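Researcher: Let's walk through a ligand-bound prediction step by step. First, I give you the protein sequence. Second, the SMILES string for copper (II) ion. Third, you return the three-dimensional complex as structure tokens. Ready?
Model: Ready.
Researcher: Here are steps one and two:
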Amino acid sequence: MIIVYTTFPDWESAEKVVKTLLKERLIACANLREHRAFYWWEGKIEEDKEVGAILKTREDLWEELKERIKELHPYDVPAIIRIDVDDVNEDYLKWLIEETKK
Amino acid sequence: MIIVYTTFPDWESAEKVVKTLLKERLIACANLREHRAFYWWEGKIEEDKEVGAILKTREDLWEELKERIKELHPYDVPAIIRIDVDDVNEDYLKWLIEETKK
Amino acid sequence: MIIVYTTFPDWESAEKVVKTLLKERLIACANLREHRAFYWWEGKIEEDKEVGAILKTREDLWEELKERIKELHPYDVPAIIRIDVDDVNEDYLKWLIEETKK
Ligand SMILES: [Cu+2]
Ligand SMILES: [Cu+2]
Ligand SMILES: [Cu+2]
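Model: Step three, the predicted complex:
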């Protein structure tokens, strides 16, 4: 399995996108929590309050999921970050496979 | 070293389990923070408020730790997710080894 | 690209350090959020409220970034944890490369 991390400008977009991804059976679950982001914009350090999203899905769904996030994301240039899971308890993995599209 | 991520239904269970794992010297530390989870239950998108837990330990303790989490977890099917750490500052790694069981 | 995770004792140190790292062009962005940490200190389970920081940068900047965090960190023994990113959308990766030092 894999984790995918992305960030959203607030809760309405984060929840809309995550619920669409669940409906499309591209993810098994999402964990959403606020953070404060700091980055460069035009020679200045910018802050933005955001909602980060930790998504859990199968490896084989990565490219499809990445494309759908690109298509749904409120940001022109979103972060869509895949981190592979090195091991997981089998009962959870079985559930995640059951809950994702075939 | 490794990270292990799991989620709990609230703070009392999260803290009880993490403190037991510390007492058993199976982890060196835990970072706990709230999130909102979205997933499928019986044809419906369900939300649950949870406490996520980021645990830090040695690679060689993974199987023992995974079994103990299974045995302590309030969920029938918990997420117990191992992500390997590709590098870490040595002083921290030494501390983590010192603080975990031998 | 890589993620680097570290923790700070509160927001002032976290923001000062992250903004210095941005100014030095060692990271492209940071996501900061509170957590509660549990760990061993002198035979007792200790808790501390902290700010965790998720940093995003290039692989080739890891050693320089790790040294700078050591030099800036309020902790004697900070956690400075590198997790490699297995894949990312190209538009984001291009932006991250553009925003980091050359
Ligand atoms: Cu905002
Ligand atoms: Cu709940
Ligand atoms: Cu504190």
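Researcher: And what stands out?
Model: Chain A has three helices and five strands. Residues C 9, 48-49 surround copper (II) ion (ligand 3) (CB under 6 Å).
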